[PDB]
Design a protein around this ligand. Structure first.
Ligand SMILES: [Cl-]
Ligand SMILES: [Cl-]
Length: 287
């Protein structure tokens, strides 16, 4: 029943997506043995290219497509062509219009977890800032989860949460610099991803400010470098995504649907795991 799978992701070279492809291959092997054909392509973050890739998978008569959408809404017609051909389409990491199932990390948990960690470390009192990012679901969920957690602690004061650091080091540097200029005492920093947190770390370094610690999100190699660094950093923790499990779950769910199971009505969320000084030596990252 499961003989071939087409996989299209943003960048096959990106360690995150390397892990996605590993997860697909491992789960395919688990379910159907060593003869499953898994075809991997990179969308290059281009909608036109990915539409073509989906149409190619349709002609090749794959049983399932694992889709990391270049454009969630724009890939819709292609997804529907696949489904009309009897192909199961499972979205990973981001939504894809019409996908039979969608698997992402629990980004809300990521935020709640990070900011519970901050609150606990601060013993439930102090000034905190949330360095925001692009207005996309994953980031917005992280912020929502974080804020809902901070609300539980009356002596935690959130000084800022609306600045968009663009998900980058450069943005995290710019935003944190402003926060440092405006706020003379910050006790904890939550950044919506690892590069943002690193940028904030750099801003602190340049300002000779060190009265806070910083938490990012993803458990990316960027975070590992900071957590394993011999030199100084204020970066102390990050909820890690598990792309390999996300991908294997995608195949597992897609196979169920292939076999006639009803599709899920809502996205399936993969738990995240807090990585810090206690488990960094143990952490199996994306590379
Ligand atoms: Cl990602
Ligand atoms: Cl960056």
């Amino acid at each position: 029943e499961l003989n071939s799978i087409g996989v299209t992701v943003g960048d096959l070279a990106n360690p995150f997506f390397v892990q996605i492809t590993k997860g697909v291959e491992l789960e395919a092997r688990k379910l159907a043995g060593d003869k499953v054909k898994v075809t991997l392509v990179s969308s290059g973050y281009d909608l036109g290219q990915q539409v073509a890739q989906i149409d190619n998978f349709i002609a090749a008569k794959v049983d399932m497509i694992i889709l990391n959408a270049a454009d969630s809404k724009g890939i819709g017609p292609a997804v529907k062509r696949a489904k009309d051909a009897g192909i199961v389409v499972v979205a990973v990491d981001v939504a894809a219009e019409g996908a039979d199932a969608t698997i992402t990390s629990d980004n809300t948990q990521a935020g709640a977890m990070a900011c519970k960690y901050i609150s606990d470390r601060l013993k439930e009192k102090g000034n905190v800032v949330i360095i925001n990012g692009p207005p996309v679901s994953a980031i917005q969920n992280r912020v929502e989860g974080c804020e809902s957690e901070f609300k539980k602690y009356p002596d935690i004061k959130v000084l800022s949460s609306n600045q968009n650091a663009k998900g980058s080091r450069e943005g995290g540097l710019e935003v944190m610099t402003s926060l440092l200029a405006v706020n003379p005492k910050i006790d904890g920093v939550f950044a919506i991803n690892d590069p943002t947190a690193i940028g904030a770390d750099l801003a602190a370094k340049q300002a000779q400010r060190n009265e806070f610690f910083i938490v990012g999100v993803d458990g990316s190699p960027d975070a590992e470098e900071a957590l394993k660094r011999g030199g100084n950093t204020l970066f102390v923790a990050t909820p890690a995504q598990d792309p390999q499990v996300m991908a294997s779950k995608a195949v597992e769910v897609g196979y169920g649907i292939l076999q006639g199971n009803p599709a899920p009505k809502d996205p399936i969320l993969i738990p995240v795991t807090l990585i810090d000084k206690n488990n960094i030596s143990t952490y199996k990252g994306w590379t």
